[PDB]
Amino acid sequence: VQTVTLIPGDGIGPEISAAVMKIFDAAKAPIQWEERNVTAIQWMIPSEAKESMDKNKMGLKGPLKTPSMNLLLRKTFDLYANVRPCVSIEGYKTPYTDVNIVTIRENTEGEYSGIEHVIVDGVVQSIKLITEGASKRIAEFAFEYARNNHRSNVTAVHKANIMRMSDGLFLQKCREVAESCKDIKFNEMYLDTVCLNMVQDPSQFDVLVMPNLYGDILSDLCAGLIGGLGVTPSGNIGANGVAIFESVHGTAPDIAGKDMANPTALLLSAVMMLRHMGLFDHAARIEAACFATIKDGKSLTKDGGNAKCSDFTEEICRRVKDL
Amino acid sequence: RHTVTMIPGDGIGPELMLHVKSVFRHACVPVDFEEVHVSSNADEEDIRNAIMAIRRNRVALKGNIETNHNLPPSHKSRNNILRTSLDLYANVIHCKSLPGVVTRHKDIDILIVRENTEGEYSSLEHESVAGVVESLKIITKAKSLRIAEYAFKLAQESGRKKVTAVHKANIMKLGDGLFLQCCREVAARYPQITFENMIVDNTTMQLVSRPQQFDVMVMPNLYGNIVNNVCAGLVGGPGLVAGANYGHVYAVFETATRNTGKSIANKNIANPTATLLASCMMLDHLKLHSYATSIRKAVLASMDNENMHTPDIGGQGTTSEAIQDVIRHIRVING
Numbered sequence A: 001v002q003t004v005t006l007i008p009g010d011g012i013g014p015e016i017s018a019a020v021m022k023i024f025d026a027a028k029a030p031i032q033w034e035e036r037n038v039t040a041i042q043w044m045i046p047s048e049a050k051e052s053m054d055k056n057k058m059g060l061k062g063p064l065k066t067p068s069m070n071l072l073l074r075k076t077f078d079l080y081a082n083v084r085p086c087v088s089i090e091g092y093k094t095p096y097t098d099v100n101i102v103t104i105r106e107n108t109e110g111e112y113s114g115i116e117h118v119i120v121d122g123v124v125q126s127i128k129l130i131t132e133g134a135s136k137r138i139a140e141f142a143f144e145y146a147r148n149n150h151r152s153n154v155t156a157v158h159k160a161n162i163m164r165m166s167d168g169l170f171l172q173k174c175r176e177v178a179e180s181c182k183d184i185k186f187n188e189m190y191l192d193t194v195c196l197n198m199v200q201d202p203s204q205f206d207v208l209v210m211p212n213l214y215g216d217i218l219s220d221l222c223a224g225l226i227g228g229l230g231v232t233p234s235g236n237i238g239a240n241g242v243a244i245f246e247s248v249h250g251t252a253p254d255i256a257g258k259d260m261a262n263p264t265a266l267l268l269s270a271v272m273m274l275r276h277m278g279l280f281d282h283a284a285r286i287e288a289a290c291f292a293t294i295k296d297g298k299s300l301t302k303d304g305g306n307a308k309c310s311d312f313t314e315e316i317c318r319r320v321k322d323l
Numbered sequence B: 001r002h003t004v005t006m007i008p009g010d011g012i013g014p015e016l017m018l019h020v021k022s023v024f025r026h027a028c029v030p031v032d033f034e035e036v037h038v039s040s041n042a043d044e045e046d047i048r049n050a051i052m053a054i055r056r057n058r059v060a061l062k063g064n065i066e067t068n069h070n071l072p073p074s075h076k077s078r079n080n081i082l083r084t085s086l087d088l089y090a091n092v093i094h095c096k097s098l099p100g101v102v103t104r105h106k107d108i109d110i111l112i113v114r115e116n117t118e119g120e121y122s123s124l125e126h127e128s129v130a131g132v133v134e135s136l137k138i139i140t141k142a143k144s145l146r147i148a149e150y151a152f153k154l155a156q157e158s159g160r161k162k163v164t165a166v167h168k169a170n171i172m173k174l175g176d177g178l179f180l181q182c183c184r185e186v187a188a189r190y191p192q193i194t195f196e197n198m199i200v201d202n203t204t205m206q207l208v209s210r211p212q213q214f215d216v217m218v219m220p221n222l223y224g225n226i227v228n229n230v231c232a233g234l235v236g237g238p239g240l241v242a243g244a245n246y247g248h249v250y251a252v253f254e255t256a257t258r259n260t261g262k263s264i265a266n267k268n269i270a271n272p273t274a275t276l277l278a279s280c281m282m283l284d285h286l287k288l289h290s291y292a293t294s295i296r297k298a299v300l301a302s303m304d305n306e307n308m309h310t311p312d313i314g315g316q317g318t319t320s321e322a323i324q325d326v327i328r329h330i331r332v333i334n335g
């Protein structure tokens, strides 16, 4: 029985957290919810949130309203690896059905170095930063992820033809790690080609590892194939064994209290959270309880038909009890 | 008669250039091609001649040069060297859904105007200290105004109604913000046209779910690279879409996605459509509109017949059977 710091956040954030908590309890999940309120101070997150995370090591984040809170959390906990597993959902159907891709994004560096200059009037310089350490680290994690999540392929995505020195260095590190992990099959690929083939046949891809800007785009691209941010798990891995798992959609202030919300994504992020800890039994049970609920497809939210967030949440609890 | 530079390139370039000549010969196109070659040599002698050949002819048709990205940063993409040296600042592609090529999405009709000489293709790069590389993305007012002027003019002249600036200015506040400001300065002179903007992240989501919303799209170099390939993939892949590279005086024409096709080269299965549609784009530039229309209607007519399709679009035909069929459809026009 472990404690997990909880950031319900804003708008529909409380509801979907309350729905995730109730489903976790209905599924007998050995989890305690140390609720917490992240917010900018002085700039820092509060000492109580900081302390909760260094203690518990695991968290769940609902949508946070608007520096950026995400930026803040990253630098605070050294969140270096954004992971987004995209899988097609039976019942919530898109023109893409064969999808099973994990987008592994370097999260500290790359094109988001935060360094821009006005060199002269009407001439701006933006710095893309690629280091040896950060590239090696995000590579090692990708290969570690594939092993621990039983994935066959890891594809390094890049633009080394154009940006030789930077993307070439990144690529150089991915090669070294791949040589130390020959049990995973490693291939390289240009970002434009990946995009080109992804929209034609996304079943060709398995695990994508890449610098900051490409990952930021491809993660959203893949998410769009499976049906949007409203059904997409996400997880950020930090320094010395810390990890937040968030709802990566908006706060939906329109329907904050009206009980039309959809907890699916935060739930899947929680399932993903459980898998990371090692509670595979509970993860698979709740995941299957969700997919089966969506597949019936009469008791769906507005995000959908006309059944409430509670009726959806109860439907999960009904089924997850009966393993 | 017009003289035009032809750069065959690597991969499927040469074999498809032969088919472009066959079609031109057959259609009695008054265009003579001065072929120039660009080797893998680290020496930039071959590429400098190609530039000069284009300066002379002002019009080129072009295959893709393969870039070995294992070589040192001194060895730069010959493709990128050409468009910057010639200052072909506007890459233009039109991704329209083809009736005969059925994909997941229909009713697509996107004009993509991409800044082609700047941004993250500026090839400015250094290692400050061992294991620390900086790449310099460059955005200027001159070039962003210039590309926005093009995109808005194109929309106005094509009867389009909306321009969308794609960007990442919420994070790249000065760089992409400058580009975005230039789009707005130009937008003030085109009140007939609707101006919107979209973050490049969200754009890719919108393209794979609801790409009917887009009309004209204008963006910096790398986002152009992404949006072009996405939109190309939506309408059925790299074999279908023709690309144009416009400068003030020069113009080079190529396949929109800019692929070698190294892995399918010399197997008579490459799709000739994109390359042919590019040669017609070049003919329209040369004011040879009647020849452009004959070949283009022939090419598009072949696409209606699924038996003519090549593997890349779900078919089983060869290149030469497709070209045969294209030539048959010019015979009925020609004689």
Ligand SMILES: Nc1ncnc2c1ncn2[C@@H]1O[C@H](COP(=O)(O)OP(=O)(O)O)[C@@H](O)[C@H]1O
Binding pocket: A190, A193, B012, B064, B066, B238, B239, B258, B259, B260, B261, B262, B263, B264, B269, B270, B271, B272, B274, B312
């Ligand atoms: N004309 C074409 N017909 C069929 N397939 C093509 C064609 N052009 C490109 N492709 C394929 O689409 C992909 C384009 O990538 P690629 O050929 O490797 O370009 P590049 O060498 O510039 O990275 C490849 O799978 C290629 O085989």
Ligand SMILES: [Mg+2]
Binding pocket: A216, A217, A220, B201
């Ligand atoms: Mg994003």
Ligand SMILES: [Mg+2]
Binding pocket: B064, B065, B258, B259, B260
């Ligand atoms: Mg290429």
